[PDB]
Coordinates of C-alpha atoms and ligand atoms in Angstrom, one line a residue:
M1 CA 43.6 13.4 -30.1
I2 CA 44.0 13.1 -34.0
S3 CA 45.6 16.5 -35.4
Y4 CA 46.9 17.8 -38.8
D5 CA 49.9 16.1 -38.6
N6 CA 48.7 12.3 -38.8
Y7 CA 47.2 12.1 -42.2
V8 CA 48.2 14.3 -45.5
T9 CA 45.6 16.4 -47.4
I10 CA 46.5 16.0 -51.0
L11 CA 46.0 19.4 -53.2
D12 CA 48.2 18.4 -56.2
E13 CA 47.8 16.1 -59.1
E14 CA 51.4 15.1 -58.8
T15 CA 51.0 13.7 -55.6
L16 CA 47.6 12.0 -56.3
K17 CA 49.2 10.3 -59.0
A18 CA 52.2 9.0 -56.6
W19 CA 49.3 7.7 -54.1
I20 CA 47.5 6.1 -57.3
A21 CA 50.4 4.2 -58.1
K22 CA 51.4 3.1 -54.6
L23 CA 47.4 1.9 -54.3
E24 CA 47.7 0.2 -57.5
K25 CA 50.7 -2.4 -56.0
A26 CA 49.1 -2.6 -52.4
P27 CA 47.3 -5.7 -51.4
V28 CA 44.0 -4.2 -50.4
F29 CA 42.9 -0.7 -49.8
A30 CA 40.6 1.4 -47.7
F31 CA 38.4 3.6 -49.5
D32 CA 35.9 6.5 -48.5
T33 CA 33.9 9.1 -49.6
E34 CA 32.6 12.4 -48.2
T35 CA 29.8 14.2 -49.6
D36 CA 27.6 17.3 -48.8
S37 CA 24.4 15.2 -48.1
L38 CA 23.0 11.6 -46.7
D39 CA 20.6 11.7 -49.8
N40 CA 22.5 8.9 -51.9
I41 CA 21.1 10.1 -55.2
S42 CA 21.4 13.7 -54.7
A43 CA 24.5 14.0 -52.9
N44 CA 27.6 15.8 -54.1
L45 CA 31.2 14.1 -53.8
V46 CA 33.0 16.7 -51.7
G47 CA 36.1 14.6 -51.2
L48 CA 37.4 11.4 -50.7
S49 CA 39.8 9.3 -48.8
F50 CA 42.4 6.2 -49.0
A51 CA 44.3 4.4 -46.8
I52 CA 47.1 2.3 -47.9
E53 CA 48.5 1.0 -44.5
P54 CA 47.6 1.5 -40.9
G55 CA 48.6 5.1 -40.3
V56 CA 49.1 6.0 -43.8
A57 CA 46.3 7.6 -45.3
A58 CA 45.1 10.7 -47.3
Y59 CA 42.3 12.9 -48.0
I60 CA 41.6 14.6 -51.1
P61 CA 39.6 17.4 -51.4
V62 CA 37.5 18.3 -54.6
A63 CA 34.4 20.3 -53.7
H64 CA 35.0 22.7 -50.8
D65 CA 33.8 25.7 -51.3
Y66 CA 33.8 27.9 -48.3
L67 CA 34.8 31.7 -48.4
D68 CA 38.4 31.4 -49.6
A69 CA 38.7 27.6 -49.8
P70 CA 42.3 26.7 -50.9
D71 CA 42.8 25.5 -54.5
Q72 CA 42.0 21.9 -55.0
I73 CA 42.2 19.0 -57.6
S74 CA 39.0 19.6 -59.4
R75 CA 36.0 16.6 -58.9
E76 CA 36.3 16.1 -62.5
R77 CA 40.0 15.6 -62.9
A78 CA 40.5 13.3 -59.4
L79 CA 37.6 11.2 -60.9
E80 CA 39.3 10.7 -64.1
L81 CA 42.4 10.0 -62.5
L82 CA 40.8 7.7 -60.0
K83 CA 38.2 5.7 -62.5
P84 CA 40.9 3.2 -63.7
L85 CA 41.5 1.9 -59.9
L86 CA 38.2 2.6 -58.7
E87 CA 36.7 0.1 -61.7
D88 CA 39.2 -2.5 -61.7
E89 CA 37.8 -5.9 -60.2
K90 CA 41.2 -6.9 -59.1
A91 CA 42.2 -3.9 -56.8
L92 CA 40.3 -5.0 -54.0
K93 CA 38.5 -2.1 -51.5
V94 CA 37.8 -2.3 -47.9
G95 CA 35.0 0.2 -46.6
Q96 CA 32.6 0.7 -43.8
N97 CA 29.0 0.7 -45.5
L98 CA 30.5 0.3 -49.3
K99 CA 26.7 0.5 -50.4
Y100 CA 26.8 4.1 -50.2
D101 CA 30.0 4.8 -51.8
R102 CA 29.4 2.7 -54.6
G103 CA 26.3 4.6 -55.2
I104 CA 27.9 8.2 -55.0
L105 CA 30.3 6.9 -57.8
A106 CA 27.7 5.8 -59.8
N107 CA 26.3 9.4 -59.8
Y108 CA 29.5 9.9 -62.2
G109 CA 29.1 7.0 -64.4
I110 CA 31.7 4.9 -62.4
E111 CA 30.9 1.4 -61.5
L112 CA 33.2 0.5 -58.2
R113 CA 34.3 -3.2 -58.3
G114 CA 36.4 -5.3 -56.1
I115 CA 34.1 -4.8 -53.4
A116 CA 35.6 -7.4 -51.3
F117 CA 35.0 -6.3 -47.7
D118 CA 32.8 -4.1 -45.8
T119 CA 33.9 -3.9 -42.1
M120 CA 30.3 -3.2 -41.2
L121 CA 29.4 -6.8 -42.6
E122 CA 32.5 -8.4 -41.4
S123 CA 31.4 -7.2 -37.6
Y124 CA 27.6 -8.3 -38.5
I125 CA 28.2 -11.8 -39.8
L126 CA 31.3 -12.5 -36.8
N127 CA 28.2 -11.7 -34.2
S128 CA 24.8 -10.1 -35.2
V129 CA 24.2 -9.2 -31.9
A130 CA 27.3 -8.1 -30.2
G131 CA 26.0 -4.5 -30.6
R132 CA 26.0 -1.9 -33.1
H133 CA 28.0 -2.4 -36.4
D134 CA 28.7 1.5 -37.1
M135 CA 32.5 2.2 -37.2
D136 CA 32.0 4.5 -34.1
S137 CA 31.2 1.5 -32.1
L138 CA 33.0 -1.0 -34.1
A139 CA 36.5 1.2 -33.6
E140 CA 35.6 1.5 -29.7
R141 CA 35.0 -2.4 -29.2
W142 CA 38.0 -3.8 -31.1
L143 CA 40.2 -0.9 -31.0
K144 CA 39.6 0.7 -27.9
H145 CA 39.9 4.1 -29.8
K146 CA 37.3 6.9 -29.9
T147 CA 36.8 7.9 -33.5
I148 CA 35.9 11.9 -34.3
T149 CA 32.3 12.4 -34.9
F150 CA 30.7 14.0 -37.7
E151 CA 28.9 16.3 -34.9
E152 CA 32.6 17.5 -33.8
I153 CA 33.3 18.7 -37.1
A154 CA 30.1 19.7 -38.4
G155 CA 28.1 21.2 -35.3
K156 CA 24.7 20.5 -34.3
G157 CA 21.1 21.4 -35.1
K158 CA 19.7 23.2 -37.7
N159 CA 23.0 25.4 -38.0
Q160 CA 25.0 22.3 -38.6
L161 CA 27.7 22.5 -41.5
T162 CA 27.8 20.7 -44.5
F163 CA 30.9 18.7 -45.7
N164 CA 31.7 21.5 -48.1
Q165 CA 32.0 24.0 -45.5
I166 CA 34.0 22.3 -43.4
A167 CA 38.0 23.4 -43.6
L168 CA 40.2 21.1 -45.5
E169 CA 42.3 20.1 -42.9
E170 CA 39.5 19.6 -40.0
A171 CA 37.6 17.4 -42.9
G172 CA 40.8 15.6 -43.5
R173 CA 41.2 14.2 -39.9
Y174 CA 37.8 12.9 -40.0
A175 CA 38.1 11.4 -43.4
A176 CA 41.7 10.2 -43.3
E177 CA 40.6 8.4 -39.5
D178 CA 37.7 6.6 -41.0
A179 CA 39.9 5.1 -44.0
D180 CA 42.5 4.3 -41.5
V181 CA 40.4 3.0 -38.6
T182 CA 38.3 0.9 -41.5
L183 CA 41.6 -0.6 -42.5
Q184 CA 42.8 -1.7 -39.0
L185 CA 39.4 -2.9 -38.2
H186 CA 39.4 -5.2 -41.5
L187 CA 43.0 -6.6 -40.2
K188 CA 41.6 -7.5 -37.0
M189 CA 38.3 -8.9 -38.2
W190 CA 39.3 -10.6 -41.4
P191 CA 41.6 -13.1 -39.8
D192 CA 38.8 -13.7 -37.2
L193 CA 36.4 -14.8 -39.6
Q194 CA 38.2 -17.5 -40.5
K195 CA 38.1 -19.6 -37.5
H196 CA 34.8 -21.1 -39.1
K197 CA 33.6 -21.8 -42.6
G198 CA 30.1 -21.1 -42.0
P199 CA 29.8 -17.5 -41.6
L200 CA 33.1 -17.3 -43.7
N201 CA 30.5 -18.7 -46.6
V202 CA 27.8 -16.0 -45.9
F203 CA 29.8 -13.4 -45.5
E204 CA 31.6 -14.2 -48.8
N205 CA 28.7 -15.7 -51.3
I206 CA 26.0 -13.8 -49.6
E207 CA 26.6 -10.4 -47.8
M208 CA 29.4 -9.1 -49.5
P209 CA 27.8 -9.9 -53.2
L210 CA 24.5 -8.2 -52.1
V211 CA 26.1 -4.8 -51.5
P212 CA 26.2 -3.5 -55.1
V213 CA 22.4 -5.1 -55.7
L214 CA 21.1 -3.6 -52.8
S215 CA 22.5 -0.1 -53.5
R216 CA 21.1 -0.5 -57.2
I217 CA 17.4 -1.5 -55.6
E218 CA 17.4 1.9 -53.7
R219 CA 18.6 4.0 -56.3
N220 CA 15.8 2.5 -58.6
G221 CA 13.1 3.8 -56.3
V222 CA 9.6 2.9 -56.4
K223 CA 6.7 5.1 -58.6
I224 CA 4.3 6.1 -56.0
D225 CA 1.1 8.0 -57.3
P226 CA 0.7 11.3 -54.9
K227 CA -2.9 12.0 -56.4
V228 CA -4.1 8.7 -54.9
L229 CA -2.6 9.2 -51.7
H230 CA -4.3 12.3 -51.2
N231 CA -7.7 11.5 -51.9
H232 CA -7.1 8.5 -49.8
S233 CA -6.2 11.1 -47.1
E234 CA -9.2 13.4 -47.5
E235 CA -11.4 10.7 -47.3
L236 CA -10.1 9.3 -44.2
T237 CA -10.3 12.7 -42.7
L238 CA -14.2 12.5 -43.4
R239 CA -14.6 9.1 -42.3
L240 CA -12.5 9.5 -39.0
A241 CA -15.1 12.7 -38.5
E242 CA -18.1 10.4 -39.1
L243 CA -16.6 7.6 -36.8
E244 CA -16.1 10.4 -34.2
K245 CA -19.9 10.9 -34.3
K246 CA -21.0 7.4 -34.9
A247 CA -19.4 7.1 -31.3
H248 CA -20.5 9.9 -29.7
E249 CA -24.3 8.7 -31.1
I250 CA -23.6 5.2 -29.7
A251 CA -23.1 6.8 -26.2
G252 CA -23.6 10.0 -24.8
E253 CA -21.7 13.6 -24.9
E254 CA -18.2 14.0 -26.7
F255 CA -15.1 12.0 -25.5
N256 CA -11.6 11.1 -26.9
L257 CA -11.1 8.0 -28.1
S258 CA -8.7 6.9 -25.7
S259 CA -8.5 3.8 -23.3
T260 CA -7.8 4.1 -19.5
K261 CA -9.0 7.6 -19.7
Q262 CA -12.2 8.1 -21.5
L263 CA -13.3 4.4 -22.8
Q264 CA -13.1 2.4 -19.6
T265 CA -15.6 5.3 -18.0
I266 CA -18.1 4.9 -20.9
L267 CA -17.5 1.0 -22.1
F268 CA -17.5 -0.8 -18.7
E269 CA -19.9 1.8 -17.0
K270 CA -22.6 0.5 -19.3
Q271 CA -21.5 -3.0 -18.9
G272 CA -18.3 -4.9 -19.8
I273 CA -15.6 -6.2 -17.5
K274 CA -13.4 -3.8 -15.9
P275 CA -10.1 -4.3 -17.8
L276 CA -9.1 -1.9 -20.5
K277 CA -7.8 -3.1 -24.0
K278 CA -3.9 -2.0 -24.4
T279 CA -2.5 -0.9 -28.2
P280 CA 0.0 -7.6 -24.7
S281 CA -1.4 -6.4 -27.6
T282 CA -1.9 -9.5 -30.3
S283 CA -2.6 -11.5 -27.2
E284 CA -5.6 -10.0 -25.2
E285 CA -7.1 -7.4 -27.1
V286 CA -10.1 -6.4 -25.2
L287 CA -11.7 -4.1 -27.6
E288 CA -11.8 -6.5 -30.5
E289 CA -13.8 -9.4 -28.4
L290 CA -16.4 -7.0 -27.3
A291 CA -16.4 -6.1 -31.3
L292 CA -18.5 -9.3 -31.9
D293 CA -21.5 -7.8 -30.0
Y294 CA -20.7 -4.1 -28.6
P295 CA -20.7 -1.5 -31.4
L296 CA -19.0 1.1 -29.4
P297 CA -15.4 -0.8 -29.4
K298 CA -15.8 -1.8 -32.9
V299 CA -15.9 1.7 -34.0
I300 CA -13.2 3.1 -31.9
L301 CA -11.1 0.1 -33.0
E302 CA -11.4 0.8 -36.7
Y303 CA -11.3 4.7 -35.7
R304 CA -7.5 4.4 -34.2
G305 CA -6.4 2.1 -36.9
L306 CA -7.4 4.4 -39.6
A307 CA -5.7 7.5 -37.8
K308 CA -2.3 5.7 -37.8
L309 CA -2.6 4.5 -41.2
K310 CA -3.0 8.1 -42.1
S311 CA -0.2 9.8 -40.8
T312 CA 2.3 7.0 -41.2
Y313 CA 1.7 6.6 -45.1
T314 CA -1.2 8.5 -46.4
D315 CA 0.6 12.2 -45.3
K316 CA 4.1 10.9 -45.3
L317 CA 4.6 8.9 -48.1
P318 CA 4.0 12.0 -50.6
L319 CA 6.4 14.3 -48.8
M320 CA 9.2 11.1 -49.9
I321 CA 9.1 11.9 -53.3
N322 CA 12.6 12.9 -54.7
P323 CA 12.5 16.0 -56.7
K324 CA 15.5 14.8 -58.9
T325 CA 13.8 11.5 -59.9
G326 CA 10.3 11.6 -59.0
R327 CA 10.3 8.5 -57.2
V328 CA 10.7 7.3 -53.5
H329 CA 13.6 5.7 -52.4
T330 CA 13.3 3.4 -49.3
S331 CA 16.4 2.6 -47.1
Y332 CA 17.5 -1.0 -46.8
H333 CA 19.4 -2.1 -43.7
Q334 CA 21.7 -5.2 -44.5
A335 CA 23.3 -5.2 -40.6
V336 CA 20.6 -4.8 -38.3
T337 CA 18.1 -8.0 -37.2
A338 CA 19.4 -10.5 -35.6
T339 CA 18.4 -13.3 -37.7
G340 CA 19.6 -12.0 -41.1
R341 CA 16.3 -10.8 -42.8
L342 CA 16.7 -7.4 -44.4
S343 CA 15.0 -4.5 -42.6
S344 CA 13.5 -1.7 -44.2
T345 CA 12.9 2.3 -43.3
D346 CA 11.5 5.4 -45.0
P347 CA 9.2 3.7 -46.1
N348 CA 9.1 0.4 -43.6
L349 CA 7.4 -1.4 -46.5
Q350 CA 6.8 -4.3 -44.2
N351 CA 4.5 -2.4 -42.0
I352 CA 1.8 -1.6 -45.0
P353 CA -1.0 -3.7 -43.8
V354 CA -1.2 -7.0 -45.4
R355 CA -4.4 -8.3 -44.9
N356 CA -6.8 -5.3 -44.8
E357 CA -8.2 -3.2 -47.5
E358 CA -6.6 0.0 -46.6
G359 CA -3.5 -1.6 -46.6
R360 CA -4.7 -2.7 -49.9
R361 CA -5.2 0.7 -51.0
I362 CA -1.7 2.1 -50.1
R363 CA -0.3 -0.6 -52.5
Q364 CA -2.5 0.5 -55.3
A365 CA -0.5 3.7 -54.7
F366 CA 2.8 2.0 -56.1
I367 CA 2.1 1.9 -59.6
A368 CA 4.2 1.0 -62.9
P369 CA 5.5 3.7 -65.3
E370 CA 4.0 3.9 -68.9
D371 CA 4.1 0.8 -71.1
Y372 CA 5.3 -1.6 -67.7
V373 CA 3.5 -3.6 -65.2
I374 CA 4.2 -4.6 -61.8
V375 CA 5.1 -8.0 -61.3
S376 CA 5.4 -9.8 -57.8
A377 CA 7.5 -13.1 -57.3
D378 CA 6.6 -14.8 -54.0
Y379 CA 8.1 -17.9 -52.0
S380 CA 5.0 -19.9 -50.8
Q381 CA 5.3 -20.2 -47.2
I382 CA 9.2 -20.8 -47.7
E383 CA 9.5 -20.9 -43.7
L384 CA 7.1 -24.0 -43.3
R385 CA 8.7 -25.7 -46.3
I386 CA 12.2 -25.2 -44.3
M387 CA 10.7 -26.9 -41.2
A388 CA 9.3 -30.0 -43.5
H389 CA 13.0 -30.4 -44.5
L390 CA 14.7 -29.8 -41.2
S391 CA 12.4 -32.2 -39.4
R392 CA 12.9 -35.0 -42.5
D393 CA 9.1 -35.2 -42.2
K394 CA 7.6 -37.5 -44.8
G395 CA 4.1 -36.2 -44.0
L396 CA 4.7 -32.7 -44.3
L397 CA 7.5 -33.3 -47.2
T398 CA 4.8 -35.2 -49.3
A399 CA 2.0 -32.5 -48.8
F400 CA 4.3 -30.0 -50.3
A401 CA 5.3 -32.7 -52.9
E402 CA 1.8 -33.0 -54.1
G403 CA 0.5 -29.3 -53.9
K404 CA -1.8 -29.5 -51.2
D405 CA -2.6 -26.5 -48.6
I406 CA -0.4 -27.5 -46.0
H407 CA -2.6 -26.1 -43.4
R408 CA -5.9 -28.0 -44.8
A409 CA -3.2 -31.3 -45.0
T410 CA -2.2 -30.7 -41.4
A411 CA -5.9 -30.3 -40.3
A412 CA -6.8 -33.6 -42.0
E413 CA -4.1 -35.4 -40.0
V414 CA -4.7 -33.3 -36.7
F415 CA -8.4 -33.9 -36.9
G416 CA -8.4 -36.8 -39.0
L417 CA -10.6 -36.3 -41.7
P418 CA -10.7 -36.1 -45.4
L419 CA -9.0 -33.4 -46.8
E420 CA -12.0 -32.1 -49.2
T421 CA -14.3 -32.0 -45.8
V422 CA -12.0 -29.7 -43.7
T423 CA -13.8 -26.8 -42.6
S424 CA -12.4 -23.4 -42.5
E425 CA -12.4 -23.6 -38.4
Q426 CA -10.1 -26.6 -38.7
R427 CA -8.0 -24.8 -41.4
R428 CA -7.6 -22.1 -39.3
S429 CA -6.5 -24.3 -36.2
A430 CA -4.2 -25.8 -38.2
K431 CA -2.9 -22.7 -39.4
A432 CA -2.5 -21.2 -35.9
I433 CA -0.5 -24.4 -34.9
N434 CA 1.7 -24.3 -37.6
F435 CA 3.2 -20.6 -37.5
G436 CA 2.6 -21.1 -33.7
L437 CA 5.6 -23.7 -34.1
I438 CA 7.8 -21.5 -36.2
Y439 CA 7.7 -18.7 -33.4
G440 CA 8.0 -21.5 -31.0
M441 CA 4.9 -20.6 -29.1
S442 CA 3.4 -22.5 -25.8
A443 CA 0.4 -24.5 -26.2
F444 CA -1.1 -21.7 -24.0
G445 CA 0.1 -19.0 -26.4
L446 CA -1.9 -21.0 -29.1
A447 CA -4.9 -21.2 -27.1
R448 CA -4.7 -17.2 -26.5
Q449 CA -4.7 -16.9 -30.5
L450 CA -7.3 -19.7 -31.2
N451 CA -9.8 -18.3 -28.5
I452 CA -9.9 -21.7 -27.0
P453 CA -9.4 -23.2 -23.4
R454 CA -5.6 -24.3 -22.3
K455 CA -5.0 -28.0 -22.3
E456 CA -7.5 -28.1 -25.1
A457 CA -4.8 -26.2 -27.1
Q458 CA -2.6 -28.8 -25.7
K459 CA -4.9 -31.6 -26.9
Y460 CA -4.2 -30.3 -30.4
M461 CA -0.5 -29.9 -29.8
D462 CA -0.3 -33.3 -28.7
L463 CA -2.0 -34.9 -31.7
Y464 CA 0.0 -32.9 -34.3
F465 CA 3.2 -34.4 -32.7
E466 CA 1.6 -37.8 -32.6
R467 CA 1.3 -37.6 -36.3
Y468 CA 4.1 -35.1 -36.9
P469 CA 7.1 -36.6 -34.7
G470 CA 9.7 -35.4 -37.0
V471 CA 8.9 -31.8 -35.6
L472 CA 9.4 -32.4 -32.2
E473 CA 12.5 -34.3 -32.8
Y474 CA 13.9 -31.2 -34.7
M475 CA 12.7 -29.1 -31.8
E476 CA 14.5 -31.1 -29.0
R477 CA 17.5 -31.3 -30.8
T478 CA 17.6 -27.5 -31.6
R479 CA 17.2 -26.6 -28.1
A480 CA 20.0 -29.5 -27.2
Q481 CA 22.8 -28.1 -29.4
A482 CA 21.5 -24.7 -28.6
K483 CA 22.9 -25.4 -25.2
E484 CA 25.6 -27.6 -26.0
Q485 CA 27.3 -24.7 -28.7
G486 CA 25.7 -21.3 -27.4
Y487 CA 24.3 -21.0 -30.8
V488 CA 21.9 -22.3 -33.7
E489 CA 22.9 -22.0 -37.4
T490 CA 21.0 -21.9 -40.7
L491 CA 21.5 -24.1 -43.6
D492 CA 24.1 -21.7 -45.1
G493 CA 26.0 -21.6 -42.1
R494 CA 24.9 -18.3 -40.6
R495 CA 24.7 -18.1 -36.8
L496 CA 22.5 -16.8 -34.3
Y497 CA 24.4 -16.6 -30.8
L498 CA 22.2 -17.5 -27.6
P499 CA 23.6 -16.0 -24.6
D500 CA 20.6 -16.3 -22.5
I501 CA 20.4 -19.9 -23.5
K502 CA 21.3 -20.7 -19.6
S503 CA 20.4 -17.5 -18.3
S504 CA 18.6 -18.9 -15.1
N505 CA 16.4 -16.3 -15.5
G506 CA 13.2 -18.0 -16.7
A507 CA 11.5 -15.4 -18.9
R508 CA 14.9 -14.7 -20.6
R509 CA 15.7 -18.3 -21.2
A510 CA 12.3 -18.6 -22.6
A511 CA 12.9 -16.0 -25.2
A512 CA 16.4 -17.6 -25.7
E513 CA 14.6 -21.2 -26.4
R514 CA 12.0 -19.9 -29.0
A515 CA 14.9 -18.1 -30.7
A516 CA 16.6 -21.3 -30.9
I517 CA 14.0 -23.0 -32.6
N518 CA 12.8 -19.9 -34.9
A519 CA 16.3 -18.3 -36.2
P520 CA 17.2 -21.5 -38.4
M521 CA 13.9 -21.2 -40.2
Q522 CA 14.0 -17.2 -40.8
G523 CA 17.6 -17.1 -41.1
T524 CA 17.4 -19.8 -43.6
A525 CA 14.6 -17.8 -45.7
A526 CA 16.7 -14.8 -45.5
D527 CA 19.5 -16.6 -47.1
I528 CA 17.6 -17.8 -49.7
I529 CA 15.9 -14.5 -50.3
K530 CA 19.3 -12.8 -50.6
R531 CA 20.7 -15.5 -53.0
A532 CA 17.8 -15.0 -55.1
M533 CA 18.2 -11.4 -55.4
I534 CA 22.2 -11.9 -56.1
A535 CA 21.2 -14.4 -58.8
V536 CA 18.4 -12.2 -60.4
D537 CA 20.6 -9.3 -60.5
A538 CA 23.1 -11.0 -62.1
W539 CA 21.2 -12.2 -65.0
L540 CA 19.8 -8.5 -65.2
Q541 CA 23.1 -7.2 -65.3
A542 CA 24.2 -10.0 -67.9
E543 CA 21.5 -10.0 -70.2
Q544 CA 20.0 -6.3 -69.7
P545 CA 16.6 -7.1 -70.3
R546 CA 13.6 -4.6 -69.7
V547 CA 13.5 -4.7 -66.1
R548 CA 14.2 -3.0 -63.0
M549 CA 14.2 -5.0 -59.3
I550 CA 12.3 -2.1 -57.6
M551 CA 11.4 -3.5 -54.2
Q552 CA 12.1 -6.1 -51.2
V553 CA 9.4 -6.7 -48.7
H554 CA 8.8 -10.0 -46.8
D555 CA 9.3 -12.9 -48.8
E556 CA 8.8 -11.1 -52.4
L557 CA 10.8 -9.3 -54.8
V558 CA 8.8 -6.6 -56.9
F559 CA 9.8 -5.7 -60.4
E560 CA 9.0 -3.4 -62.9
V561 CA 8.7 -5.3 -66.4
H562 CA 7.9 -3.9 -70.1
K563 CA 4.2 -5.1 -70.8
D564 CA 5.5 -6.8 -74.1
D565 CA 8.0 -9.0 -72.1
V566 CA 6.4 -10.3 -69.1
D567 CA 5.9 -13.6 -70.3
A568 CA 9.6 -14.7 -71.1
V569 CA 10.5 -12.4 -67.9
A570 CA 8.4 -14.2 -65.5
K571 CA 9.4 -17.7 -66.7
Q572 CA 13.2 -16.3 -66.0
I573 CA 12.7 -14.7 -62.7
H574 CA 10.8 -18.1 -62.0
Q575 CA 13.5 -20.4 -62.9
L576 CA 16.1 -18.4 -61.1
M577 CA 14.5 -18.1 -57.7
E578 CA 13.5 -21.9 -57.5
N579 CA 16.0 -23.4 -59.2
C580 CA 19.4 -21.1 -58.6
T581 CA 19.1 -20.9 -55.0
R582 CA 19.1 -23.9 -52.5
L583 CA 17.8 -27.2 -54.4
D584 CA 17.3 -29.0 -51.2
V585 CA 14.4 -27.0 -49.8
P586 CA 11.0 -27.8 -51.9
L587 CA 10.5 -24.2 -53.0
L588 CA 7.2 -22.7 -55.2
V589 CA 7.6 -19.0 -56.6
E590 CA 4.1 -17.5 -57.1
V591 CA 4.4 -14.9 -59.9
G592 CA 1.7 -12.5 -60.3
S593 CA 1.5 -9.1 -62.6
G594 CA -0.8 -5.8 -62.6
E595 CA -0.9 -2.2 -63.2
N596 CA -0.1 -1.9 -59.8
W597 CA 1.4 -3.8 -56.7
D598 CA -2.1 -4.5 -55.4
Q599 CA -2.8 -5.9 -58.7
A600 CA 0.2 -8.1 -59.3
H601 CA 0.3 -9.0 -55.2
Ligands
ZN1 ZN1 33.2 9.7 -44.1

């Protein structure tokens, strides 16, 4: 148990100063902030904790205000004394999710520098799939130590306390332990992170430098117009009512729009093969087949999609506007995906329909402030260009080299016809093949996406490998080393460990073999995107132009640029993204602008 004897609670300047002096001569020190909220932009600093050595840590309360709380160094005095150390790039800090901390300090005009180690990221790079990368999971895995939980000091449910209401010493136990455990975790993981120059490279030049740029992107937020969203909601209520009527009218009586309950009894009872359509889904969608002739499945389909969209973005988004900035602040997660791509929540920007009109209207609500424009910079099929390189295929490499549509180029070879004559159906077939290879899909899988018979799909795949031999050789070689070493790598050294690579279980080893082929391309795209963000952010920080990087979704970076600077800025973003990342993969950045994200997109 952690008691009040473990860590000191600093309540006077003289003592704070004695610690600042020791901190100033330490090789590295753990740092942590405690606040009255999870919302970064509006949270208030309540206290700070440091750890100079395992077992030697302190908690400095500055804003606890429960009834009769003892005197504390003021938030302002503590920060002016701590500011020099915190802003000194030479004073190296360790922490668990330093992104949060860097931002809190920014609420006071302090730029945390020396952001050298983040134990969450050390863990993530050591093995992204070892398990959760939060401090409590980490402490238990590497230290066989269970940490004091927030719920243990604050309580649960609606009556949970906010940090400023917790007694000084209890808050101390929690806060000082964080700092202490964090430093211990670093001492155990940092040495390990050196057994290999690949992960070390990614951790050092990709992951750590990205910490402060994500903080800045998140705190910038994005301007969302709530009127547009509201009218879209009202219209969707009318449209959903209308569709409900159109459905009742196509059949007879009233009924819910749920399959395997009300639909199979109507749809199949009036002709159609018995199997219902599961919302599995993108592999055999019963309702959409019928759609080509049967009108009911069509309106039920278009109904559900609209209902999901309304409650997920039309009704939720306006509620996400922060009263303090008047903008929305999405959460980017840097240590969650297995391949290294950034994920996103509240809102999850990647789930906004891309090829659909309603998705387009959602994006029309992401607007640029007065005298500014939204700019979208996209890496054209970066994953496919990465495959051309990894397969050393002169065919693909040349297609990209001369600017041809790889899907039409691919079709012209697989079907053997001039590029000008390739039809829309042939382009659609080549495209399914191409993107199917990335996700390592089976000839049968391809068939299920192309709506053609088995072995006909096999026919297309054999023709492809004959024309593009380098891709089969890459695929075989990759599944090989995957079994030889138990993991695959990205161009920068990032690793995805594949434990079921020999699973014996068919399905699991199947998944592990698809992952083997895929991860290197997706992880590499991820690494390129992060390097571009770091690069563009560095220019932004150095030159201070009239632009803000507000979003990162899929393979695009979105900015707010002053209307009178768009041309020079576009030239610059463009050169940085395709000339300041990797010079080996043939990259192309499509830059576009408009009044909203939909127009620039
Ligand atoms: Zn904490």
